[PDB]
Design a protein around this ligand. Structure first.
Ligand code: CLA
Ligand code: CLA
Ligand code: CLA
Ligand code: CLA
Ligand code: CLA
Ligand code: CLA
Ligand code: CLA
Ligand code: CLA
Ligand code: A86
Ligand code: DD6
Lengths: 164, 34, 65, 169, 164
């Protein structure tokens, strides 16, 4: 499996701890599916952390609450009623397994020639977003359990313009 | 980490070095005397 | 001789007998574990003997109740 | 330029400004590589050893006497000197075992094959050797820097970072 | 499909709306899988709506909440924090998709010349349990919105000795 989309400089084939050693194409396909889905989720999650720092929807999630009062980070998993979170989870699942409001043919453009290049770019961005989402989670959760413990104030510490 | 604990671990190391020197002596001879 | 129902269930447990791994097997792990156990035992013995004094551990009757 | 030594990496290439791996013998280059590997192994261990005891002093986790005056790991020479002496002695004994068993040219293969894991292919191995070497080089530099800095201004690593405004804790 | 498993005397082949005409056997397999899974879950429901009315486990589901106070039924949801609910949902999924902790071979017996009779019993029990859960949910929710509605203030009305 040394020649399959994902081999890019600097590291030629990054399987240090021998995971692709004795596997059939089915297991590597499962691994690639997990990688691609994880990466997409991470990119969307990073964009989601950034954007509610300067824009919040105008509706009222949950009976009361309102979309403009909820905290932004690791919180907001404990400020939205559990029933709503479960319904969101199952809707994402419907889009995931059944693939429903998520297969519109206008979403598969004709990548004339550049198909492999764009697949490689998408995978690499997924990797970067997975690391970024880990960093954001660590900073927020640690500075929530003990306010401070990093010195760096603000949730998105890096883009100071958002004043947050 | 009191004085007692430091002395105890240092004693463990002394036992280690004693066993080690005995083993080193045995290895040297046993080999040079098949 | 007299195969009993239980015996049928427990047969695989006693099936293999005399099987052995050649060449010292996992003996060095046994040595490591035995040594660490010896260290643990001397630690406990010297704490109980008050020959090894540690903060927050007073070998005396205490008020559990 | 090089003769097949697994080292040499993209950042630079074949780093040999002084011309040592041309004025040496076939056995001399082998000894040089062994020297490198061993120094690196020790160093890496020493860097981790500097980091963890010192941090345990910073966190008040070993009492209020562990590395008493400042917190420097170079202070064991004052508190518990005989412990350090016996530890160097035990290291010396196990390394005499090395010198006795291993033969010239090896001195790095501890025959720890089943007792541990290893990459299964061959290319990955070449990579792992290069890694071991690189981590060792960085650790050598780090150990020299730690020792020099601490001998300069008696102050632990993390505290030297906290003061002088280089961290945010 | 008028000979597949699932035909008993009261209402032999139940398909009034014609939902199983022209379908391929692959789908009818999926439909039967859904029926069995729903039936098992509904049995476990109709058994989990009853047990807490006289026996609460004792532990602490979340850092402050105790399974001695959270009300039973469609009310416990908004008590257990959403992160805990999620941490469950995903584990149940681990048992459902990757088949972990639920495939122990010594749980699958050899029904022999009964494997066509016990499966039918399981299916019919599931069919009854689904309707039982429907009724329990109706009572519970209708009273959780407007307390006192239907008059029967208790929960498991049909088992009065329990003192619901
Ligand atoms: C009920 C809704 C639902 C359903 C039916 C599915 C169905 C599926 N997902 Mg999926 N997913 C969902 C919601 C759902 N998803 C949501 C909301 C997310 C977050 C964006 C994901 C993220 C996700 C990823 C990243 C992956 C899947 C995968 C899969 C496939 C099998 C693995 C699986 O689900 O077992 C679940 C088995 C587990 C062991 C669960 C792991 C639990 C993690 C490690 C920790 C949980 C943290 C905590 C509980 C949740 C906090 C986040 C939450 C508050 C948003 C399958 C098609 C995998 C796949 O396609 O193939 C491998 C895969 O890689 N999903
Ligand atoms: C849970 C997330 C996840 C998953 C399922 C995978 C899965 C995979 N990665 Mg991957 N990767 C991840 C996170 C993940 N990665 C992250 C965070 C990074 C950034 C450090 C990378 C960086 C990375 C590289 C650089 C390479 C892989 C490769 C691979 C494939 C073979 C290696 C393997 O897993 O065996 C496999 C499909 C290799 C590949 O493309 O195989 C063909 C490869 O060269 N990954
Ligand atoms: C169809 C349908 C129906 C009948 C409902 C009904 C409900 N939703 Mg809802 N929902 C739906 C589709 C539907 N949803 C869809 C398609 C989504 C997108 C995933 C959501 C996302 C959603 C959220 C995020 C929340 C609700 C909530 C609620 C409840 C509002 C509070 C209450 O008691 O009334 C209510 C039971 C709220 C809730 O559960 O509060 C208790 C809540 O926070 N819903
Ligand atoms: C929670 C709901 C949800 C989720 C997870 C997705 C997820 C996705 N949608 Mg999407 N979509 C949704 C609701 C959702 N959609 C709705 C309600 C609409 C109607 C407005 C669309 C209309 C839509 C289009 C038109 C396209 C997607 C596309 C996509 C994919 C990018 C991704 C799989 C793209 C594929 C694409 O082209 N979606
Ligand atoms: C005792 C330490 C030591 C030794 C023996 C070696 C040995 C070697 N290194 Mg090396 N290296 C070291 C430390 C060491 N390294 C450190 C700390 C770094 C990080 C900066 C590097 C970075 C490095 C690179 C980037 C490369 C090598 C390479 C080599 C090989 C060819 C160079 C040569 O002939 O030897 C060089 C060493 C000596 C002849 C003896 C030590 C040098 C003098 C005596 C020290 C002088 C004091 C010093 C300046 C104080 C600071 C050889 C096996 C090259 C290679 O892989 O070749 C294929 C290569 O590309 N090394
Ligand atoms: C999750 C809900 C669910 C699902 C997916 C099914 C699915 C199915 N049922 Mg079913 N059923 C359900 C709930 C459900 N049932 C309930 C609640 C009852 C009790 C009233 C029944 C009572 C029932 C009978 C009595 C029969 C079916 C039959 C069937 C099968 C063919 C009819 C059909 O749906 O097309 C199909 C596999 C038929 C069957 O098994 O034909 C082989 C059949 O005769 N069902
Ligand atoms: C991460 C958790 C997780 C995951 C990955 C799965 C994965 C799966 N489940 Mg599943 N399940 C779970 C948790 C999970 N389950 C839990 C907690 C329950 C309740 C005990 C169930 C009850 C359940 C049933 C009853 C059925 C499945 C089915 C399935 C399969 C397809 C599901 C589908 O199309 O999407 C989900 C698609 C939807 C449209 C969601 C519908 C949700 C309903 C309409 C209302 C939800 C309201 C909420 C509050 C798939 C193997 C189905 C199956 O195997 O055959 C098809 C099936 O019949 N599951
Ligand atoms: C909480 C998640 C969960 C779920 C949904 C199930 C679900 C199931 N288990 Mg199960 N199980 C679980 C946790 C779970 N188990 C744990 C934590 C253990 C370890 C004690 C077991 C040990 C276990 C055994 C030993 C067996 C099941 C069995 C079963 C099936 C009946 C059913 C699919 C049976 C199949 C069976 O024989 N389970
Ligand atoms: C046992 C058995 O049977 O099999 C074994 C076989 C084998 C091969 C042994 C095994 C292995 C692999 C092992 C053990 C690998 C270990 C690798 C290891 C331990 C690698 C350390 C690197 C540390 C570095 C580079 C330090 C950086 C530190 C740097 C660069 C610094 O800047 C330090 C710093 O101080 C400066 C200089 C200035 C200060 O002001 C600031 C700070 C403090 C930041 C296994 C897997 O265990 C199995
Ligand atoms: C346990 C518990 C909880 C829970 C729960 C859960 C998971 C409850 C689950 C409830 C569930 C799973 C309810 C399914 C119903 C499916 C039905 C009724 C199907 C009907 C189908 C019927 C009536 C008939 C269909 C057809 O006849 C038609 C119409 C024409 C025919 O041709 C074909 C057939 C015969 C098929 C909470 C709430 C999470 C918190 C609480 O604290 C603890």
């Amino acid at each position: 499996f040394e020649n399959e989309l994902g081999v890019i400089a600097p590291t030629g084939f990054f399987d240090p701890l021998g995971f692709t050693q004795d596997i059939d194409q089915e297991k590597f396909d499962q691994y690639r599916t997990a990688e691609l889905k994880h990466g997409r989720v991470a990119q969307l999650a990073v964009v989601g952390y950034v954007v509610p720092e300067f824009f919040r929807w105008g509706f009222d999630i949950a009976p009361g609450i309102a979309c403009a009062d909820v905290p932004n980070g690791v919180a907001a998993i404990n400020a939205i009623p559990a029933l709503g979170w479960a319904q969101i989870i199952f809707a994402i699942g419907a889009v995931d397994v059944r693939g429903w409001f998520g297969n519109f043919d206008i979403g598969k453009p004709d990548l004339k020639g550049k198909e492999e290049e764009r697949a490689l770019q998408e995978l690499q961005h997924g990797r970067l977003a997975m690391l970024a989402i880990l960093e954001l989670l660590r900073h927020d959760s640690q500075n929530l359990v003990k306010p401070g413990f990093d010195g760096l104030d603000n949730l998105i510490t890096g883009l100071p313009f958002l004043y947050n | 980490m009191t004085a007692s604990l430091s002395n105890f671990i240092a004693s463990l190391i002394a036992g280690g070095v004693v066993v080690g020197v005995i083993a080193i002596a045995l290895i040297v001879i046993s080999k040079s005397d098949r | 001789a007299l195969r009993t129902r239980l015996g049928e269930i427990l047969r695989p447990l006693n099936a293999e007998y005399g099987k052995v791994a050649p060449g010292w097997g996992t003996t060095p792990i046994m040595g490591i574990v035995m040594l660490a156990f010896l260290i643990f035992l001397v630690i406990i013995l010297q704490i109980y003997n008050s020959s090894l004094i540690i903060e927050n551990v007073d070998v005396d009757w205490a008020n559990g109740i | 330029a090089p003769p097949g030594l697994v080292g040499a990496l993209p950042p630079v290439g074949f780093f040999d400004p002084a011309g040592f791996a041309a004025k040496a013998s076939p056995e001399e280059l082998s000894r040089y590589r062994e020297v490198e590997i061993m120094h690196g192994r020790f160093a890496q261990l020493a860097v981790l050893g500097f980091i963890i005891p010192e941090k345990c002093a910073y966190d008040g986790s070993f009492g209020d006497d562990f590395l008493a005056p400042t917190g420097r790991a170079l202070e064991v020479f004052n508190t518990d000197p005989l412990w350090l002496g016996l530890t160097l002695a035990v290291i010396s004994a196990l390394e005499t075992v090395r010198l006795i068993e291993t033969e010239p040219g090896t001195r790095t293969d501890a025959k720890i094959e089943s007792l541990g894991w290893r990459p299964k292919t061959e290319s990955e191995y070449i990579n792992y050797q290069v890694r071991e070497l690189q981590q060792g080089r960085l650790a050598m530099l780090a150990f020299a820097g730690e020792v020099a800095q601490e001998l300069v201004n008696d102050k632990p690593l993390l505290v030297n970072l906290q003061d002088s405004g280089f961290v945010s804790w | 499909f008028e000979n597949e498993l699932g035909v008993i005397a009261p209402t032999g082949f139940f398909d009034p709306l014609g939902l199983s005409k022209n379908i391929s056997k692959e789908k009818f397999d999926e439909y039967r899988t859904a029926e069995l899974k729903h039936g098992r879950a509904a049995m476990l429901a109709v058994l989990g709506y009853i047990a807490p009315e006289t026996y609460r486990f004792g532990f602490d589901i979340a850092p402050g909440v105790s399974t001695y106070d959270i009300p039973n039924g469609v009310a416990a949801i908004d008590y257990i924090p959403a992160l805990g609910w999620a941490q469950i949902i995903f584990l149940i999924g681990a048992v459902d998709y990757w088949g972990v902790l639920g495939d122990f071979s010594f749980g699958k017996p050899d029904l022999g010349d009964k494997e066509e009779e016990r499966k039918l019993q399981e299916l019919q029990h599931g069919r009854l349990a689904m309707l039982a859960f429907l009724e329990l949910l109706r009572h519970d929710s209708q009273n959780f919105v407007s307390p006192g509605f239907d008059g029967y203030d208790k929960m498991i009305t049909g088992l009065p000795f329990m003192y619901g």
